[PDB]
Amino acid sequence: QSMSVKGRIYSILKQIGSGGSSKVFQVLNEKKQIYAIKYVNLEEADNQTLDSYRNEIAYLNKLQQHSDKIIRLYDYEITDQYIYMVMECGNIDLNSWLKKKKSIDPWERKSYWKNMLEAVHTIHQHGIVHSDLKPANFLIVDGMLKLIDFGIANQQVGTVNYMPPEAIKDMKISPKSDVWSLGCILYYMTYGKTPFQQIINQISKLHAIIDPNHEIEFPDIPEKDLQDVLKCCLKRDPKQRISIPELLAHPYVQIQ
Numbered sequence: 059q060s061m062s063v064k065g066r067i068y069s070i071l072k073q074i075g076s077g078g079s080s081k082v083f084q085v086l087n088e089k090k091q092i093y094a095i096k097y098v099n100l101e102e103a104d105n106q107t108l109d110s111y112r113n114e115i116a117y118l119n120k121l122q123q124h125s126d127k128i129i130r131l132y133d134y135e136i137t138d139q140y141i142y143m144v145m146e147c148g149n150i151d152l153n154s155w156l157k158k159k160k161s162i163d164p165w166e167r168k169s170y171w172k173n174m175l176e177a178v179h180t181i182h183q184h185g186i187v188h189s190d191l192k193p194a195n196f197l198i199v200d201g202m203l204k205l206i207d208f209g210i211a212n213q214q215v216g217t218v219n220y221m222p223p224e225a226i227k228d229m230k231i232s233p234k235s236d237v238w239s240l241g242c243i244l245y246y247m248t249y250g251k252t253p254f255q256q257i258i259n260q261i262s263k264l265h266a267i268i269d270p271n272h273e274i275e276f277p278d279i280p281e282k283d284l285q286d287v288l289k290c291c292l293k294r295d296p297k298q299r300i301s302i303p304e305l306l307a308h309p310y311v312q313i314q
């Protein structure tokens with residue numbers, strides 16, 4: 059099964075992902091280069107939804123040039139019936155890599171954290187706050203992490219483990235919200251779980267996340283600097299929580 063995008067032909071290799079009206083495929087082109095093509099069927103999409111999709115594509119096309127920690131978009135084809143997006147193919151999502159993982163080299167972790175900050179910093183400079191950041195939003199490629207999306211288009215997902223307190227109360231958003239989520243990610247990568255993963259019940263979990271007397275646990279570890287990043291990222295009050303530009307200057311990423 060071959061498909062054609064902007065005149066060029068790509069042989070399918072396998073499906074990777076799915077969605078309501080979205081499919082992702084690993085493909086090869088004429089020169090045997092490998093890409094991921096996303097196909098979105100628009101038949102059943104509202105004006106607002108189309109508008110959410112066109113916005114994200116304009117943002118990905120643009121932000122590409124400002125960081126290589128953002129996934130590559132090589133080309134796209136868009137009609138009233140479909141979108142095809144030719145994008146960079148990664149090695150594995152960060153969430154899958156993290157699930158099937160014994161522990162992490164401290165060096166690797168630091169380096170993956172740097173990449174997450176860079177990518178999210180980039181979108182914040184352009185006025186985008188992602189607001190639903192999770193391990194699945196990052197992709198490993200050549201031992202680097204790349205951000206795969208910006209949170210803008212409509213519609214493993216559902217999880218609330220990464221959701222900041224002020225997103226629970228509010229149901230405007232600030233970049234401090236992405237810093238909480240990134241923080242839970244690095245908590246996972248440090249202690250092997252998210253900071254509320256124990257609370258199986260959903261409603262106790264949401265009440266634990268917002269309640270200023272539920273003290274989050276920070277077991278001691280050799281890297282005092284990583285312990286500190288985490289505590290600064292997981293402050294419940296956005297105005298106390300560390301900012302991205304601050305995180306970029308923190309001993310944890312700069313020192314050694």
Ligand SMILES: CC(C)CNc1nccn2c(-c3ccc(C(=O)NC4CC4)cc3)cnc12
Nearest residue numbers: 074082094118146147148149150151206207
């Ligand atoms: C082959 C597979 C096991 C590992 N690779 C991958 N796993 C999961 C997702 N992957 C992509 C991928 C890249 C981008 C998008 C995507 O939909 N981005 C939105 C901005 C428009 C969706 C999927 C590109 N490569 C992958």
Ligand code: NA
Nearest residue numbers: 164165167168
């Ligand atoms: Na580390």
Ligand code: NA
Nearest residue numbers: 207209210211
């Ligand atoms: Na998105």
Ligand code: NA
Nearest residue numbers: 218219220221
């Ligand atoms: Na959370």
Ligand code: NA
Nearest residue numbers: 219252253254
């Ligand atoms: Na959690």
Ligand code: NA
Nearest residue numbers: 305308310311
């Ligand atoms: Na940092």
